[PDB]
Amino acid sequence: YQLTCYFTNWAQYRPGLGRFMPDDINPCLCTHLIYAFAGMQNNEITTIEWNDVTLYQAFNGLKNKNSQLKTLLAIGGWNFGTAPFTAMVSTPENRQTFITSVIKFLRQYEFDGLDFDWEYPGSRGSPPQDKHLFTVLVQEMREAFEQEAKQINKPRLMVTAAVAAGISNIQSGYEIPQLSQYLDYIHVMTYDLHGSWEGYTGENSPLYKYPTDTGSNAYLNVDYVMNYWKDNGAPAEKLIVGFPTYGHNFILSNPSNTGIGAPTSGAGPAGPYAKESGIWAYYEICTFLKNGATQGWDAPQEVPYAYQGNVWVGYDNVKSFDIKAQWLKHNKFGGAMVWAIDLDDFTGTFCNQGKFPLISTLKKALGLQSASCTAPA
Ligand SMILES: Cc1[nH]c2ccccc2c1CN1CCN(c2ccccn2)CC1
């Protein structure tokens, strides 16, 4: 199994114990590390943060401590939008310009591949033609990667994609069988499946449906989404299940109504470290629990929740990660990806479950505890 972990280049800006740099990553923890995010200018890949080059050096330098470790650069993200992607795929000339720039960039900064984080082809502003044009882009990149590997006689650069979990988004965004042929890995964003935008409490990443999930809401779980991808043309072994080391929080309309589907009045409070509206890092959730919150277990969906006063949080813990990992193995998927390494209790000081308790749980469950971790020759 692969264990693929996303690192975010804005985690450096978090105060005190929240600050997370490339050198805070345990090089032995994950099989793949992905750097979020890269941007685009004039159809060419670029940095985003002022110190990205320095961070690339430290990030990819982790491979000097684990000879097996592979790294990828993620282009796009939610704030990036679809506009530069649409413009870049719109003409073959723009695509060639992009692919050329990507090869140069990845080789220069010592990445082993590119992860497409276009959110999403065919939606969020992206026109209908982008569904097919994304397939074309991916194939062209893959084939360009294959050609380059032979000309310079080095291992081939990988091409992967983070892909939608919402059924409508999937249907308008991806030619699944064709896309699956050229992608090395398919990173399925099986989270953010519920949130305050809905007006009621719901789980970030429930494994199965809740009994009250009727109609289209019955698609809002990890099991349905992964099987949707598989059944519609993606090989199980290329499919990578998304695991969140963060939760979504809510303001309860009635503090005495604390179950799944309870009315909410909006997003819950930003955390003191991530400072994200309606989102808490796992280590931020541990503080919540330590400060007197009541623990809940959403049994049908195999995930925890917690509440105190008018604040309610749906998340993942050691127990839920373990359950999902067993499910993953039974279903013979390619492995797990994690958003994000910097949101797990990396110091171990918040949850008292050891360093990186959530990702370590995956490492153990997926048979990677004895994985080789030695500096290269
Ligand atoms: C929007 C947002 N901001 C945050 C700040 C801290 C923690 C979580 C979040 C999220 C929610 N998703 C996280 C996962 N993600 C992606 C994006 C690309 C690839 C994988 N996964 C989509 C947004």
State whether 75 and 211 are in the same domain. Answer: yes
Supply 42's token pair: 């004039």
Ligand 1 centre from 321 Cα, in Å? 18
Q: Measured between alpha carbons, how far is 218 from 88 in angstroms, rounded to an integer?
A: 36
Residue 148 contacts residue 200 (beta carbons within 8 Å): no
Find all residues with CB under 8 Å of 333, minimum gap 6, and list them. 1, 226, 236, 237, 239, 240, 241
339 annotated among ligand-binding-site residues: yes
Supply 80's token pair: 């990036």
Q: Is 10 in the pocket of ligand 1 (CB under 6 A)?
A: no
Helices (H), the chain: 52-60, 83-89, 92-109, 130-152, 167-173, 176-182, 222-231, 282-290, 318-330, 357-365
First to last CA, the chain: 25
Q: Measured between alpha carbons, how far is 338 from 34 in angstroms, rounded to an integer?
A: 10
88 annotated among ligand-binding-site residues: no
Q: Is 76 left (phi over 0), alpha (psi -120 to 50) or beta?
A: left
Q: Measured between alpha carbons, how far is 96 from 90 in angstroms, rounded to an integer?
A: 11
Closest Cα to atom 1, ligand 1: which residue?
78
Q: Measured between alpha carbons, how far is 124 from 147 in angstroms, rounded to an integer?
A: 33
Ligand 1 centre from 192 Cα, in Å? 8
Closest Cα to atom 12, ligand 1: which residue?
192
**Which of 279, 315, 338 should be mutated for ligand 1, with most atoms under 8 A from CB?**
279
Q: Measured between alpha carbons, how far is 108 from 106 in angstroms, rounded to an integer?
A: 6
Residue 346 contacts residue 250 (beta carbons within 8 Å): no
224 annotated among ligand-binding-site residues: no
Using alpha carbons only, give the angle 106, 108, 110 rounded to the nearest 5 degrees: 60
DSSP string, 234-250: --GGGEEEEEESEEEEE
Q: Which residues does the chain break after (C to N > 2.5 Å)?
A: none
- What's 47's domain CATH number? 3.20.20.80
Q: Is 375 left (phi over 0), alpha (psi -120 to 50) or beta?
A: beta
Ligand 1 centre from 279 Cα, in Å? 10
State whether 63 and 79 are in the same domain. Answer: yes
Q: Is 116 in the pocket of ligand 1 (CB under 6 A)?
A: no
State whether 208 and 299 are in the same domain. Answer: no
The residue type found at 230 is K
79 annotated among ligand-binding-site residues: yes
Rg of the chain over all Cα atoms, to the nearest angstrom: 20
State whether 344 and 298 are in the same domain. Answer: no
Q: Is 338 in the pocket of ligand 1 (CB under 6 A)?
A: no
State whether 150 and 258 are in the same domain. Answer: no
**Paired strand residues for 35:** 7, 73
Residue 117 contacts residue 41 (beta carbons within 8 Å): no
* Cα–Cα nearest to 295, from 283, 277, 278, 307: 307
118 annotated among ligand-binding-site residues: no
Burial class (CB in 10 A: 0-12, 13-18, 19+), 353: middle
Ligand 1 centre from 372 Cα, in Å? 30
Q: Measured between alpha carbons, how far is 197 from 248 in angstroms, rounded to an integer?
A: 11
Residue 275: give the domain boundaries. 245-315
Q: End of a domain among 315, 343, 364?
A: 315
Q: Is 175 in the pocket of ligand 1 (CB under 6 A)?
A: no
Helices (H), 9-129: 52-60, 83-89, 92-109
State whether 231 and 250 are in the same domain. Answer: no
The ligand 1 atom nearest the CA atom of 281 = 7
Which residue reads 């050096």 in tokens?
57
State whether 125 and 218 are in the same domain. Answer: yes
Q: H/E element holding 311? A: strand 311-314
Residue 248 contacts residue 204 (beta carbons within 8 Å): yes
158 annotated among ligand-binding-site residues: no
Q: Measured between alpha carbons, how far is 370 from 333 in angstroms, rounded to an integer?
A: 20
State whether 203 and 299 are in the same domain. Answer: no
Supply 27's token pair: 């090089």
DSSP classification of residue 200: B
State whether 231 and 154 are in the same domain. Answer: yes
Closest Cα to atom 3, ligand 1: which residue?
276
188 φ, ψ to 5°? -85, 125
Q: Is 119 a catalytic residue?
A: yes
Q: Is 5 in the pocket of ligand 1 (CB under 6 A)?
A: no
Q: Measured between alpha carbons, how far is 122 from 120 in angstroms, rounded to an integer?
A: 6
Q: Each residue of 178-187: b (16+ CB within 10 Å) or e?
A: ebbbbbbbbb
- What's 308's domain CATH number? 3.10.50.10
State whether 66 and 185 are in the same domain. Answer: yes
The residue type found at 140 is E
* Number of domains comprising the chain: 2
Supply 373's token pair: 């971790």
State whether 298 and 332 are in the same domain. Answer: no
The residue type found at 256 is S
Residue 186 contacts residue 239 (beta carbons within 8 Å): yes
Q: Is 246 in the pocket of ligand 1 (CB under 6 A)?
A: yes
State whether 51 and 154 are in the same domain. Answer: yes
Residue 292 contacts residue 197 (beta carbons within 8 Å): no
Of 93, 110, 119, 143, catalytic:
119
